[model samples]
Target chain A: KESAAAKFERQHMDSGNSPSSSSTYCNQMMRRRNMTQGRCKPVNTFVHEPLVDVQNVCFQEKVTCKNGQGNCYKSNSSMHITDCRLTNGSRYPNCAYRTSQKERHIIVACEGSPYVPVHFDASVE
Target chain B: KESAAAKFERQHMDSGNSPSSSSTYCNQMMRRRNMTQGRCKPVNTFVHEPLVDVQNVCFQEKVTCKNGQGNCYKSNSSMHITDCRLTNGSRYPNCAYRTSQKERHIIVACEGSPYVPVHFDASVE
Candidate 1:
């Protein structure tokens, strides 16, 4: 049997030009979209140490709603936040959330140093 | 000037033997720990579309608190939830959250198809 990593490579490579591939390609396309949309492209904040004793770190970013022509429709905003607490004596922080929409929230977390923020160069469709 | 990719390669290559490197390396090391800790290893869920008209998808995960030698301490637990909403007509779902801790809730969102879940193999330190 092919190794799991090789299997993945074959599947992705054979997936061909379809909507599925489009979704997978979004990570790259979104980066370009951000560049063209006059926005700062996502930057990776690689953590260099275990966040020992960290209580909480939160930041707010403004996202504007736009139509097909890239025109603003309804102006809405939301906040992205995270709370880190010591899990056991080792300090494993858990995350939680609420937002202003009807879809399910997709939470992604990166642990350890060289950690990449959850929204690293993401764009809404 | 070195290309940004080259710059990153050099910086990572030079940051040797230290707690910081330990933190950065934790992404790899923790995978090993999880392998030995009798826990299901983190899996990757790659998205393949725009997730248009998605109302809500919620799943509950249980986390147990432990001490230095990986012993249960307070046995505290928390939930990971997200709400996505359509932004403009393009269906950009925004996320929100709440949890049972003093820490800030870390919310991560992925857009477009082939989207990777926010917590693709993460471990709390």
Candidate 2:
């Protein structure tokens, strides 16, 4: 069973790659990370920061989740990230993506005994 | 492991009861469906139609997912549904919900050999 934290990491963390200037960045990463399976995820975000940094956001600032839950936290500083949105004309099985890189403060929902980031809520510029 | 189809049903199907006039419908159903764990789901939609009819949506007209995937299908006719949205002041572990009922055409992302709805993409009036 994949833990929520693990699933979050699988979908959002991409520490090794930066300056994702390649136009196909999202196209390649979305498939590589399994977001393209069954059907393409409509929209997703990835943090180009270390797992530790993202994890630490769980302790940064308490915030309300979009769902009205209080388990969410926002990063204290901006982080390098990429937003992957499915192209308007893209089709499943051919999951195409448009990658846009940005620096923003990220919000994530944390849970579990150890308290770690389990969901990528959103990013604020 | 819980299949995606099962998860979809768990979150979006509530066919046993209708005329959800109770003010507590969302507050009760969100928790009962296990969507309030860790954190409340920001927004969710539950269908009041029979399981068989909802399943048939997989074979309905294909449409683009909000994420650009082509595996999504739209219902030919509107279905009764309940929209559950968490209140802004609500907190974790004590999830509160605001419920609204509507009749809309539902769209779902379908996958696998059996072709079942795996995700509730959206609903349209």
Candidate 3:
């Protein structure tokens, strides 16, 4: 069984592939990460910076969460990120994703001990 | 700023609608919650159980995260959940999602103080 923290890493964290240049980055990722096992995951985001770099967003800029909560933080820098969306024809076992890279300010929910990122609220361009 | 906990509630928590039969649940929810404003969120999950019921999963059964971490948990019972996926033709400012309801064991990450759930890992049907 994978732990929740580790799950976050699989879905959102990726330090080795920064400045991704491939359009197929997502297609390979969604499948490589095993998000396509039973069916395709419709939409997902991947952060391409170091874990420490992403975690630092917690103390950067204070912002309101989409839910009107005030525990969210916005990144001061436009970090590299990838948005993956499943193609229309994509179906169970054949999930395909369109990858798009961007530099945006991300919103995240941070909590506990060292105050690491817990949730990805949204990304602003 | 929305607290990380509140963001979790808005994006993953939803106890108002149960046995959701409408196919448009995701389409309306994605926008109603403002997830469609900046851009359509590709994939997201909504839990229809009470906050207590969902939180109790942490102590129910322990599991591992997809990324090989072991701090995840699995529910002992089937739960009511809605999965939202973006449509192929969906574009910015008009983000659309396909609504899907299922009964499955949910996976989440829990931490700190009361040990409340903070991250929605995935669902198992």
lDDT of 1 at B64: 34
Clashes of each: 34, 2, 23
Instruction: Name the candidate that leads on TM-score.
Output: 2
Better of 2 and 3 by lDDT: 2
For candidate 2, report its TM-score.
0.42
- Global lDDT of model 2: 0.68
lDDT of 1 by residue, B1-125 (tens): 74533332322211122221112122222232232134322322122122221101112222232212211111122212211111223211211111111111222222223432222221222
What would the C-alpha RMSD of candidate 2 be, to one decimal place? Answer: 22.6
Candidate 2 regions exceeding 4 Å error are A1-125, B1-22
Candidate 2 chain B, run of 10 with poorest lDDT: B11-20
The list of candidate 3 runs beyond 4 A from truth reads A1-125, B1-22
Candidate order by decreasing lDDT: 2, 3, 1
lDDT of 1 by residue, A1-125 (tens): 65533332322111112211112122232232232144322222121222221101112222332322211211122212111111123211211111111111112222223432222122222
Model 3 chain B worst lDDT run, 10 consecutive residues: B12-21
Question: Model 1's CAPRI class?
Answer: incorrect
By summed lDDT, which 10 consecutive residues of candidate 1 chain A come out lowest? A94-103
What level of docking quality does candidate 2 show? Answer: incorrect
Candidate 3 C-alpha error for residue B6, in Å: 52
